[PDB]
Structure 1
Amino acid sequence: IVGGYTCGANTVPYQVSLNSGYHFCGGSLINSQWVVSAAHCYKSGIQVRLGEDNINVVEGNEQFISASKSIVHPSYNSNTLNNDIMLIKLKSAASLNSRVASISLPTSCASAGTQCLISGWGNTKSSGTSYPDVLKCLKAPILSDSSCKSAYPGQITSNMFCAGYLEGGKDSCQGDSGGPVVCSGKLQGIVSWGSGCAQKNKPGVYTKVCNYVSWIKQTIASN
């Protein structure tokens, strides 16, 4: 997260870290057996780490659980990043408590100007590299689709929205990939892509989760 703040330990209790020997992507817990993250975070051999704040120190509230199956969206296009969403089922159900909680799926899409919270353990510098050990948070608005498509001509589909700041300096970044964008208590977005991080006139692009609720609900029920 570039230009955000330290969240505070376990204040985003639905945030998941995907680990394959190291942290490489974020995710969101949507019920005790299922996680949603981005398709561009697919790997074989994922362990889902719940209850995390410092990902380098075991602090007492973590649950480490291996994925039993991963389902990448049937129409994910890795070149356009269109339909960038994947479901991960846990080998055993997480124990929900104050520090491990699920987030609700949206009943409708959010409008431009709604304020959201984005969170992740990804890169914190726009020019350079510095990876945090504790969860970073950023408050950011959904932007008009006009300013989203003018920043990226011909690349935005109906399954994508922009959120952030056109002046730059505040954005999600690699390492935040697959993580939550929550607006009004609902999971509205997944950290998907952008041009670098926190560059002027190049906002973050996010998977528009409200287009996918039927596929999510039908797939978790049959798996």
Structure 2
Amino acid sequence: IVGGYTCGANTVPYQVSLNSGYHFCGGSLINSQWVVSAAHCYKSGIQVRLGEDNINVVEGNEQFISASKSIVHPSYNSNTLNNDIMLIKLKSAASLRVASISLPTSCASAGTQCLISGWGNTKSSGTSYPDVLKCLKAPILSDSSCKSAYPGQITSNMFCAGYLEGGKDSCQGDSGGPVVCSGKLQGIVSWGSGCAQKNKPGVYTKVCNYVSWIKQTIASN
């Protein structure tokens, strides 16, 4: 998160860290046994870390749980990045500092806003990964401006959020993290052109289009 602020210990209870010997992606707890993240975060040997603030030191409120299953959307396209969503089943249920986030009943409109969080890079030009969780409030942008920023790359399953001036954005290490609006999970950190660059807002997976797929998939696995 570039241009954000320190959230504060466990103030974002649904935020999880995907660990493969080091933090590589974020995710959101949507059930005591299920986590939602990005399809491009798929990796074997994933350990999910819950109740984390400082990802580098054990503070006592954590729960490290291995994933038993990782279901990437059947229509995920690694080239166009369309359908960049994945579900991870925890080997055992988490003890709900730790809480799930609600799935949306409806899609959010431009102007809404949202809270984006993660442990990704905090510098636009350079590298600086934080210890604690960073937060950012950014508004959802209109489909047209999003499409103007990334010609022929935006599908109906993606939405832009951020600022055209630049300086505030998600960045490497934030992928799979939550974009929560009005207490509902509206997006998943996905891609962008660089970080916090002018006229290049971040792109996110539009969660409202997958709610029925998510509910049915959780229930039959």
Please state how far the C-alpha of 1:33 moved relative to its aligned partner.
Answer: 0.4
Cα deviation code 1:21-61 (max 9, x no counterpart): 00000000001000000001000000000000000010010
Please state how far the C-alpha of 1:20 moved relative to its aligned partner.
Answer: 0.3
Q: Equivalents in 2 of 1:213, 1:35: separation in Å?
A: 13
Q: Equivalents in 2 of 1:75, 1:174: separation in Å?
A: 24
What secondary structure is seen at the aligned counterpart in 2 of 1:92? coil
State percent identity of aligned pairs. 100
Q: Equivalents in 2 of 1:54, 1:173: separation in Å?
A: 18
Aligned position for 1:131: 129
Q: Equivalents in 2 of 1:154, 1:56: separation in Å?
A: 40
Cα deviation code 1:135-167 (max 9, x no counterpart): 000000000111100000000000000000000
What secondary structure is seen at the aligned counterpart in 2 of 1:141? coil
Q: Equivalents in 2 of 1:90, 1:201: separation in Å?
A: 38
Q: Equivalents in 2 of 1:14, 1:144: separation in Å?
A: 27
What secondary structure is seen at the aligned counterpart in 1 of 2:40? helix
Q: Equivalents in 1 of 2:37, 2:48: separation in Å?
A: 11
Cα deviation code 1:53-91 (max 9, x no counterpart): 000010010000000000000000011110000000000
Q: Equivalents in 1 of 2:169, 2:145: separation in Å?
A: 16
Long gaps (5+) in structure 2: none
Q: Equivalents in 1 of 2:31, 2:142: separation in Å?
A: 31
Q: Equivalents in 1 of 2:63, 2:104: separation in Å?
A: 26
Cα deviation code 1:109-139 (max 9, x no counterpart): 0000000000000000010000001000000
Q: Equivalents in 1 of 2:9, 2:183: separation in Å?
A: 19
TM-score (norm: length of structure 2): 1.00
Q: Equivalents in 1 of 2:175, 2:65: separation in Å?
A: 20
TM-score (norm: length of structure 1): 0.99
Please state how far the C-alpha of 1:19 moved relative to its aligned partner.
Answer: 0.2
Q: Equivalents in 1 of 2:79, 2:172: separation in Å?
A: 17
Cα deviation code 1:141-199 (max 9, x no counterpart): 00011110000000000000000000000000110000000000100000000001000
What secondary structure is seen at the aligned counterpart in 2 of 1:36? strand
Q: Equivalents in 2 of 1:19, 1:133: separation in Å?
A: 14
What secondary structure is seen at the aligned counterpart in 1 of 2:210? helix
Aligned position for 2:89: 89
Long gaps (5+) in structure 1: none
Q: Equivalents in 2 of 1:106, 1:216: separation in Å?
A: 11
What secondary structure is seen at the aligned counterpart in 2 of 1:53? coil
What secondary structure is seen at the aligned counterpart in 1 of 2:28? strand
Q: Equivalents in 2 of 1:141, 1:127: separation in Å?
A: 23
